[PDB]
Amino acid sequence: ANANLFVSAENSQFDNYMSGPQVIEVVVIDSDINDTDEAKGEPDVTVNGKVLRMVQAVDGNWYGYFADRDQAQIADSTATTADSGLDFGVFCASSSGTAALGFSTTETDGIAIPITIANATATGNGTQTGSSSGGAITTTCAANTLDASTANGTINVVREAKDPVAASGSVSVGQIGLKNG
Amino acid sequence: DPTDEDSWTFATNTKNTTSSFNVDTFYQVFDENGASGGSALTLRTTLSSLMCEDNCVLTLDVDAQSSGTPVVTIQDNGDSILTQLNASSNTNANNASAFGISTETAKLGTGSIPVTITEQGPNSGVFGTYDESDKSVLKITDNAKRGTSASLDYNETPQTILVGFSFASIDIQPVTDEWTSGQEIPVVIVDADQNKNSRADEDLDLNNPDVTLIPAL
Amino acid sequence: ANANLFVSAENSQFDNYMSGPQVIEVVVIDSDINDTDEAKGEPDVTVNGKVLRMVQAVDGNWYGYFADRDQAQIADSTATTADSGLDFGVFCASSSGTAALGFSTTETDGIAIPITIANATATGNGTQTGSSSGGAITTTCAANTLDASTANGTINVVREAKDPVAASGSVSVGQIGLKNGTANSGPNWPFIQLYELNPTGNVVVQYNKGGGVQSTTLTFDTVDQFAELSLDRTVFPRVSQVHATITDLWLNIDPTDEDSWTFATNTKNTTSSFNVDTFYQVFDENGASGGSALTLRTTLSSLMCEDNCVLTLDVDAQSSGTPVVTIQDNGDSILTQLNASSNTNANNASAFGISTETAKLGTGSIPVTITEQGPNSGVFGTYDESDKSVLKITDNAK
Amino acid sequence: EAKGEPDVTVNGKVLRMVQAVDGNWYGYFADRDQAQIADSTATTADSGLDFGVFCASSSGTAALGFSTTETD
Amino acid sequence: TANSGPNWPFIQLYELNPTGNVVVQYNKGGGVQSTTLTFDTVDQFAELSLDRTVFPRVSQVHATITDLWLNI
Amino acid sequence: ANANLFVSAENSQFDNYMSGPQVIEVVVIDSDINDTD
């Protein structure tokens, strides 16, 4: 398990394999950045050399969730009703990170946010259901996309998530700037 | 889910021959505490594209030799909501095709034996049909015949569920050479037919009608 | 004990068994969430896969209390007067959590809150006394139920509860939203969450944290295989103290307090109306009143007692005319010589009784009191802290 | 910062701990009968073995401002 | 206000068993610390020692008393 | 990689060579100065 980095797929029994539409949790536990009332720096975590953005939680631990792009899209197409079966929520482009989450997600292939689309435009508002075949995600998401959402928390593949650290003094939500924690 | 306890529900009846019917797999039709937790959505035609290699499908055959008496039935437990949809007096609890899920009757209705498994720990990868009270979804029928069997399949490797009886042995064990007045010595019975639960310790209580035999002096 | 999860029933001596109407305390102690001025997230704790709601206290620890649904209901039916005997207070439905406590309790079989019912309606106001048989709890509780309550703190099965953390700035009462946080005298804290458990079946308590999960498994079964009595010596001289120690898991109802039990043990009282009986908290651990005496003899079968909840005594076994054992007051009981006539003396065990409770614990019917050696030990004794036993050998014994 | 009181027990009963300026937690206890017997010698206040004034366990909330109910 | 105020310090009274053990526990994450003490008469640890055997005419008599009981 | 100083061109395979119009990243990671408020 190393010392300070924990990854869900790290299992000796299964020889560190992962497969299918599964989500992988990355946790950092370290005493250097464990405080929640001071603005310590986000820990620098990468998968295949690309940056993984980590949110601090109330236990003083840093969380991040990732999955394969095509498997998330293919699995999400089965979820015909929202927040049931394998729903990853809504597929947004990498550029949408700043407008939707409030921080940059540009070194990722795409993000999956738990909202619903009210105004199903072709461009500015992402894809609710995903593609049965998969591929590149190109539809973007904006700030007006979040406010118009009529049902939050539509992700069903992660259900037990720790509370993001609150905004006090110098500290932002999740210590990295989530718009709603 | 890496943070939660994962629940899966299967349509396993391999002898439902209705043209519309197919063996199928569903995700989170229940919770780990036996709540609703959402609708049932088809996964059968997509399992090829989600990296499934003969390992995402559960099938069951209640009567393998077609003797007329079904060996295995299904029952409710603490991690599922199963209901007897045919409540007619003409049938009983040994009819596996008389159970279904009430909220999801298109694909998990009468016939099409629904079977539910639950994850033993948030991020373990080990699933079971038992609940925390040790009550399995799958039970052997009360009128089952010796020698007959059922067949359960995961990962395209079937296993037989054989029904059999066990010879018993009783033996009083005197602590020393002679049993004298005012001394407790053990009496030991070995009969596998009274071990009806492998996850629980069982007592031969007079008052329980389902304990069929009790020692007597 | 794992690292950060503590469950009361976790005892190597008794092999993690639990039985009867007992309440179980779950405590989380961790340095990651120990602060009380910041809004840290409730820790994620489940029993048999169902959510356990945890309140933060002033020591920076998270508490939750649970019990079997049917055993709480059956035991509560014995408590005929409020806040005496085995009272769990009032039984509310799962939906009532939001209206009564101020937060959701929907993944539970029922909740037990410490109030009293003023307006005993059929629907909107819960059950005061519980069912002798048990079953599903369907009566609901509302916000107007709390306000109309005329006596708060009626739970007697949990008596030593830590103070809920106070509401300052972003922080709510108990950090999860209790509507009134005065412990052991208020209408919300403590409260017991009811779960339907399987006799002879396992009970699993889990805590999910970053870097791995802690579990504790318990067994729910009759526990007469761990129960025994020990005496201090083999042979007793004439004015000796008889120091009797009882170990019984079943007798530790309160996980936070020192449990007191009182017995009518005279097996030769032959009066037709008389029966050997068991009473709960007729005294304190400090020898105070601590409530009335309420019958448990006809209910012990339904509370999972298998030949292990009954104390009997025979003062003269060989009927020689001289009684070997008598009884005396000590620091953990209030015993009185009701026959104070000069014609009798202190060797007459039948001349002692309890003054406040004379129907069933009067003259004759030798009352015997035991006290728990530690809040959550399960080891009881007749000795007090001055080493004065209740049971003494008579001066003229043969 | 408002850190939680550490959980300290004597013979299984809770000991209430006060924080001091050195960042340490303190508590003081004694046998009940010995304090009472010794206090009877102190006929003038704040001289000899005076423990001050003896209060009941319930008095903790009204006098100190926090609960002392698991004490004698 | 310490040692001149009405609340600090204060002593919590406990009923203890003569010739019996007294156990102090602290419960923290990752294990518990315990310390056990005995409550009994302590005249078996008490003695007086003098600095010398023979004393000349204007000597100091240096007497040392060790007694657990005397440390109130 | 030392302890607290990271330079992009530090590659054992290529023997710490650099060439051409390339940009080089220098990163300092230390717990003494890691705060941002």
Side-chain angles (χ1 to χ4, degrees):
Chain A
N2 313 140
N4 302 83
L5 167 71
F6 304 108
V7 184
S8 296
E10 195 182 14
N11 185 326
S12 176
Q13 175 188 354
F14 299 132
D15 190 68
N16 293 320
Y17 274 79
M18 60 161 290
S19 181
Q22 274 176 162
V23 186
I24 311 284
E25 187 184 48
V26 187
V27 181
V28 169
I29 302 168
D30 187 1
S31 64
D32 295 330
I33 57 176
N34 62 11
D35 57 2
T36 66
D37 53 321
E38 283 182 289
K40 296 297 174 44
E42 184 180 4
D44 165 57
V45 167
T46 70
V47 57
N48 294 115
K50 294 179 293 289
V51 64
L52 196 67
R53 296 301 295 278
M54 315 273 291
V55 161
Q56 208 180 204
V58 296
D59 67 336
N61 286 165
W62 292 93
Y63 292 85
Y65 297 104
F66 78 93
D68 175 327
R69 181 190 59 190
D70 289 318
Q71 302 287 252
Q73 285 185 101
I74 286 155
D76 194 55
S77 55
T78 58
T80 279
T81 191
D83 208 347
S84 304
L86 301 163
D87 212 349
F88 290 89
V90 168
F91 282 96
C92 290
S94 299
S95 68
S96 296
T98 300
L101 310 191
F103 63 90
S104 180
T105 62
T106 304
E107 206 67 16
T108 66
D109 294 324
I111 57 163
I113 64 174
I115 62 172
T116 187
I117 296 94
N119 198 320
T121 59
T123 292
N125 293 315
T127 58
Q128 177 59 54
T129 189
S131 298
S132 79
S133 48
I137 312 167
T138 63
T139 52
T140 59
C141 296
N144 61 0
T145 301
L146 290 178
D147 187 320
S149 171
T150 62
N152 291 318
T154 64
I155 290 186
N156 201 262
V157 296
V158 173
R159 306 181 295 277
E160 297 289 331
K162 316 287 165 155
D163 290 347
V165 175
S168 66
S170 61
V171 186
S172 190
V173 174
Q175 217 153 85
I176 68 164
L178 275 51
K179 292 222 255 221
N180 175 299
Chain B
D1 194 291
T3 65
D4 204 344
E5 299 84 1
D6 283 308
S7 193
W8 288 95
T9 302
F10 298 100
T12 70
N13 188 0
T14 186
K15 298 187 167 173
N16 185 326
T17 55
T18 290
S19 64
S20 64
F21 179 69
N22 299 110
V23 169
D24 206 330
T25 305
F26 305 83
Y27 178 74
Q28 288 285 123
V29 182
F30 295 134
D31 277 346
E32 69 269 10
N33 62 33
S36 179
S39 314
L41 297 162
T42 302
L43 284 156
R44 60 180 301 263
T45 67
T46 304
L47 292 184
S48 63
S49 293
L50 289 181
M51 295 183 61
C52 287
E53 298 292 329
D54 56 308
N55 64 1
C56 301
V57 178
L58 190 51
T59 67
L60 167 59
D61 192 348
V62 298
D63 188 357
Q65 291 80 23
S66 298
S67 278
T69 301
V71 165
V72 170
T73 181
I74 64 174
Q75 49 163 142
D76 181 77
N77 68 357
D79 291 318
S80 52
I81 310 175
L82 192 74
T83 286
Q84 211 199 345
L85 303 174
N86 190 358
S88 174
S89 78
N90 297 305
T91 189
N92 55 329
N94 297 350
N95 193 6
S97 309
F99 289 87
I101 293 168
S102 173
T103 40
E104 297 299 318
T105 293
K107 296 185 164 283
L108 291 160
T110 202
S112 87
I113 295 108
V115 172
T116 301
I117 63 172
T118 299
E119 202 199 21
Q120 296 320 313
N123 185 72
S124 166
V126 173
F127 295 77
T129 50
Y130 31 93
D131 73 347
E132 286 65 69
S133 326
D134 290 317
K135 184 150 88 123
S136 189
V137 167
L138 292 172
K139 183 177 68 63
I140 302 283
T141 43
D142 62 13
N143 49 322
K145 284 156 177 191
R146 61 183 259 267
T148 59
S149 62
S151 81
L152 187 58
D153 171 72
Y154 195 76
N155 205 50
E156 280 188 22
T157 320
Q159 290 196 301
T160 179
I161 299 161
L162 185 70
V163 162
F165 303 147
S166 181
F167 288 136
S169 66
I170 188 163
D171 178 62
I172 315 180
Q173 272 153 36
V175 61
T176 186
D177 183 9
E178 284 199 354
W179 189 23
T180 70
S181 177
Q183 292 182 195
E184 288 190 344
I185 74 178
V187 164
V188 187
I189 298 86
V190 172
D191 198 20
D193 291 331
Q194 302 271 42
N195 183 2
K196 289 151 143 42
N197 199 309
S198 70
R199 299 169 51 72
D201 50 331
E202 303 171 78
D203 296 334
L204 280 65
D205 317 292
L206 244 75
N207 76 292
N208 184 353
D210 314 340
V211 176
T212 48
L213 312 154
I214 297 165
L217 181 151
Chain C
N2 312 141
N4 302 84
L5 167 71
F6 303 108
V7 182
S8 295
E10 196 185 12
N11 185 325
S12 176
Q13 173 190 355
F14 299 132
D15 190 68
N16 293 320
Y17 274 80
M18 60 162 289
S19 172
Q22 270 175 163
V23 188
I24 311 283
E25 188 184 48
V26 186
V27 182
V28 168
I29 301 167
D30 187 0
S31 64
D32 296 330
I33 57 176
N34 63 11
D35 57 2
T36 66
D37 52 322
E38 280 186 290
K40 298 296 178 42
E42 187 178 3
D44 166 56
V45 168
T46 68
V47 58
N48 295 113
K50 293 182 293 291
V51 63
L52 196 66
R53 297 300 295 277
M54 316 271 291
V55 161
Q56 208 179 203
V58 295
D59 66 337
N61 287 164
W62 292 92
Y63 292 85
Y65 297 105
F66 79 93
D68 176 327
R69 181 191 59 190
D70 289 318
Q71 301 288 253
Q73 286 184 103
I74 286 155
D76 194 54
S77 55
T78 58
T80 278
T81 192
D83 208 347
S84 304
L86 301 163
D87 211 349
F88 290 89
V90 169
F91 283 95
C92 290
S94 299
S95 68
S96 297
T98 300
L101 309 190
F103 63 89
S104 181
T105 62
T106 303
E107 298 186 353
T108 66
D109 294 324
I111 57 164
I113 64 174
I115 62 172
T116 187
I117 295 94
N119 198 321
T121 59
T123 291
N125 294 314
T127 58
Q128 178 59 54
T129 190
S131 298
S132 80
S133 48
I137 315 171
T138 63
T139 52
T140 59
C141 295
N144 60 2
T145 302
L146 290 177
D147 187 322
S149 172
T150 62
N152 291 317
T154 63
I155 289 186
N156 201 261
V157 296
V158 175
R159 306 182 295 277
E160 297 288 319
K162 311 275 193 146
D163 291 347
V165 172
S168 66
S170 61
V171 187
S172 191
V173 174
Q175 217 152 86
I176 68 163
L178 275 52
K179 292 221 258 219
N180 175 300
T182 69
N184 311 264
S185 71
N188 298 150
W189 183 250
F191 70 94
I192 300 93
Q193 294 144 15
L194 277 304
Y195 293 119
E196 185 59 31
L197 305 170
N198 181 236
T200 77
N202 295 96
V203 174
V204 172
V205 177
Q206 277 200 2
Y207 167 51
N208 303 305
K209 71 176 286 191
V213 302
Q214 289 111 301
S215 295
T216 290
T217 189
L218 317 168
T219 301
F220 189 55
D221 195 10
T222 69
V223 295
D224 64 355
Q225 71 274 18
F226 306 129
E228 72 189 330
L229 188 151
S230 64
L231 303 165
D232 51 329
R233 342 153 71 128
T234 45
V235 67
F236 285 89
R238 284 222 261 228
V239 164
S240 288
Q241 298 298 290
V242 179
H243 290 299
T245 311
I246 301 185
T247 189
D248 200 335
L249 188 155
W250 192 87
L251 278 165
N252 182 32
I253 299 299
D254 194 291
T256 65
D257 204 344
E258 299 83 1
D259 283 307
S260 193
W261 289 94
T262 301
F263 297 101
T265 70
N266 188 0
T267 186
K268 301 192 164 170
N269 185 326
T270 55
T271 291
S272 64
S273 64
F274 179 69
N275 298 110
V276 170
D277 206 330
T278 305
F279 305 84
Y280 178 75
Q281 288 284 123
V282 180
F283 295 135
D284 277 347
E285 69 268 10
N286 312 330
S289 178
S292 316
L294 298 163
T295 302
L296 285 156
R297 61 179 301 264
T298 68
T299 302
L300 293 184
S301 62
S302 294
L303 289 182
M304 294 182 64
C305 287
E306 296 293 329
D307 55 308
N308 63 1
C309 302
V310 179
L311 190 52
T312 68
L313 168 58
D314 193 346
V315 299
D316 187 359
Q318 292 80 21
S319 298
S320 278
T322 301
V324 165
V325 170
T326 178
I327 64 173
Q328 49 163 142
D329 182 77
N330 68 357
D332 290 318
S333 51
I334 309 172
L335 191 75
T336 289
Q337 211 198 339
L338 304 172
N339 191 358
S341 174
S342 78
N343 298 306
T344 189
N345 54 329
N347 297 350
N348 193 7
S350 308
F352 289 87
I354 293 168
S355 174
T356 39
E357 297 299 319
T358 291
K360 298 181 154 284
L361 294 157
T363 202
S365 87
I366 295 109
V368 173
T369 301
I370 63 172
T371 301
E372 203 198 22
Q373 297 319 314
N376 184 72
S377 167
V379 172
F380 296 77
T382 49
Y383 30 95
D384 73 348
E385 280 60 74
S386 329
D387 290 316
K388 184 149 88 124
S389 189
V390 168
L391 291 171
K392 183 176 69 62
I393 301 283
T394 44
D395 62 13
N396 49 323
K398 283 166 186 183
Chain D
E1 282 182 289
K3 296 296 174 43
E5 184 179 3
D7 166 57
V8 166
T9 70
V10 57
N11 293 116
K13 294 181 293 291
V14 64
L15 196 67
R16 296 301 294 277
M17 316 271 291
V18 162
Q19 208 179 204
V21 296
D22 67 337
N24 286 165
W25 292 93
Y26 292 85
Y28 297 105
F29 79 93
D31 175 327
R32 181 191 59 190
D33 290 317
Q34 302 288 252
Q36 286 184 101
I37 286 156
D39 193 55
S40 55
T41 59
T43 280
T44 192
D46 208 347
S47 305
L49 301 163
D50 212 348
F51 291 88
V53 168
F54 282 96
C55 290
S57 299
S58 68
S59 297
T61 301
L64 310 190
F66 63 89
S67 180
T68 62
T69 303
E70 206 67 16
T71 66
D72 294 325
Chain E
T1 70
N3 312 263
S4 71
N7 298 150
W8 183 250
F10 70 95
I11 299 93
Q12 294 145 14
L13 277 304
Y14 293 119
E15 186 59 32
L16 300 172
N17 183 235
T19 79
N21 298 313
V22 171
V23 173
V24 177
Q25 276 197 1
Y26 168 50
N27 305 304
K28 71 174 289 190
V32 303
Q33 288 111 301
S34 296
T35 290
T36 188
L37 315 169
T38 302
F39 189 55
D40 195 11
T41 69
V42 296
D43 63 355
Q44 70 275 17
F45 306 129
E47 72 189 330
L48 187 158
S49 65
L50 302 167
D51 51 328
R52 342 154 72 128
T53 45
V54 65
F55 283 90
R57 286 224 258 231
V58 164
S59 288
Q60 298 298 290
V61 179
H62 289 300
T64 311
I65 300 184
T66 188
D67 201 335
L68 187 154
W69 192 86
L70 278 165
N71 182 31
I72 300 299
Chain F
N2 313 140
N4 302 84
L5 167 72
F6 303 108
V7 184
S8 297
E10 196 180 16
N11 184 328
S12 176
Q13 175 188 352
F14 298 132
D15 190 68
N16 294 320
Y17 274 79
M18 60 162 289
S19 171
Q22 275 175 159
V23 185
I24 311 284
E25 187 184 49
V26 189
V27 181
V28 168
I29 302 167
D30 187 1
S31 64
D32 296 330
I33 57 176
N34 62 11
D35 57 2
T36 66
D37 52 321

